[PDB]
Design a protein around this ligand. Structure first.
Ligand code: JWQ
Length: 329
């Protein structure tokens, strides 16, 4: 009895066949740079796990960004550092430039390339149909890369997608929640922002994979093309699943949990209800129709599936007709 196991349908065995040093981040040995190379200019932001500063690298006169990690498990720190080093140079992956020991926090400070960002409230108010297709494709490059390298991001959301719109430059950031995918491994479901959490997380299914990121990407896409941010706006993790079910319907939710022999929290008995699956056209109106096309809706439809094994992979997504109009390098 109990839930049915699951495996990724792609990149299943990447970490199996890479050497142990690649994924065994607990044994990684950090090469420290010199903290005096970087002069902090201003604080950019603060989160649960870090503070971020604009800085100058006074050895080359280049702007950088410094992420000073808040005290946390050595394991979580080494995990992020190892993942960043493994992915460095990949398409639209934020580039780790240095690692220093901050003298005040006495924790690692990660030094990254500087991206001249516009925060996603003003940007998302402007982006055209063409812009959204372009930047989605750029996100997909990053996701196929990290998935192909055995890593799931697990925190895909607008805040973690930096865009310097002037230079049409995109970087996927904050790999602090990212993990190595190992077939059969059970993972923490307390990942991703509420609004971007996949159904697998919301029904407490731990044996998930790269396809989690594709659900999150779908949530981003829906918010952008329908001009509703966030799209699934739950007030807590339970209501989050109810909001999803009011769109995707309850019958396919039950098919999903029945497939994996998953049982819903009895707390859903009085709040879930019975809901038909809705057609995506109902979210189209005169103020977002310029961002919507049959191709957009089909693409969105193929990302937002309950069954994590049924979602487009990043590579499959890049083959979708939605991207036919995007100029390719
Ligand atoms: C929060 O985690 C990260 C954050 C960042 C970078 C930024 C953040 N947050 C970042 O560069 N933010 C900026 N905000 N304004 C910038 C400006 F105005 F200087 F362009 S950069 C890079 C890697 C990370 O893992």
């Amino acid at each position: 009895s109990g839930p049915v196991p699951s495996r990724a349908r792609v990149y299943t065995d990447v970490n199996t066949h890479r050497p142990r040093e690649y994924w065994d981040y607990e044994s990684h040995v950090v090469e420290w740079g010199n903290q005096d190379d970087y002069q902090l200019v201003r604080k950019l932001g603060r989160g649960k796990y870090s503070e971020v500063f604009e800085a100058i690298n006074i050895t080359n006169n280049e702007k950088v960004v410094v992420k000073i990690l808040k005290p946390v498990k050595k394991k979580k720190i080494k995990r992020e550092i190892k993942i960043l080093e493994n992915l460095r140079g990949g398409p639209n992956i934020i580039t780790l430039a240095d690692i220093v020991k901050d003298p005040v926090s006495r924790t690692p400070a990660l030094v990254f390339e500087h991206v001249n960002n516009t925060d996603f409230k003003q940007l998302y108010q402007t982006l055209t149909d063409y812009d959204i297709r372009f930047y989605m494709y750029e996100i997909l490059k990053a996701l196929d890369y990290c998935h192909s390298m055995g890593i799931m991001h697990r925190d895909v959301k607008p805040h973690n997608v930096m865009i310097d719109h002037e230079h049409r430059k995109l970087r996927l950031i904050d790999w602090g929640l990212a993990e190595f995918y190992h077939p059969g491994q059970e993972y923490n479901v307390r990942v991703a922002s509420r609004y971007f959490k996949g159904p697998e997380l919301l029904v407490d299914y731990q044996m998930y994979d790269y396809s989690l990121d594709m659900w999150s990407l779908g949530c981003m896409l829906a918010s952008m093309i329908f001009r509703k941010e966030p799209f699934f706006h739950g007030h807590d993790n339970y209501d989050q699943l109810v909001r999803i079910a009011k769109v995707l319907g309850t019958e396919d939710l039950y098919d999903y949990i029945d497939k994996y022999n998953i049982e819903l929290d009895p707390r859903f008995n009085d709040i879930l209800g019975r809901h038909s699956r809705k057609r995506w056209e109902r979210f189209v109106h005169s103020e977002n129709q310029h961002l919507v096309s049959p191709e957009a809706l089909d693409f969105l439809d193929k990302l937002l599936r309950y069954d994590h094994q049924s979602r487009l992979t990043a590579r499959e997504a890049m083959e979708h007709p939605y991207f036919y109009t995007v100029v390719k390098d």
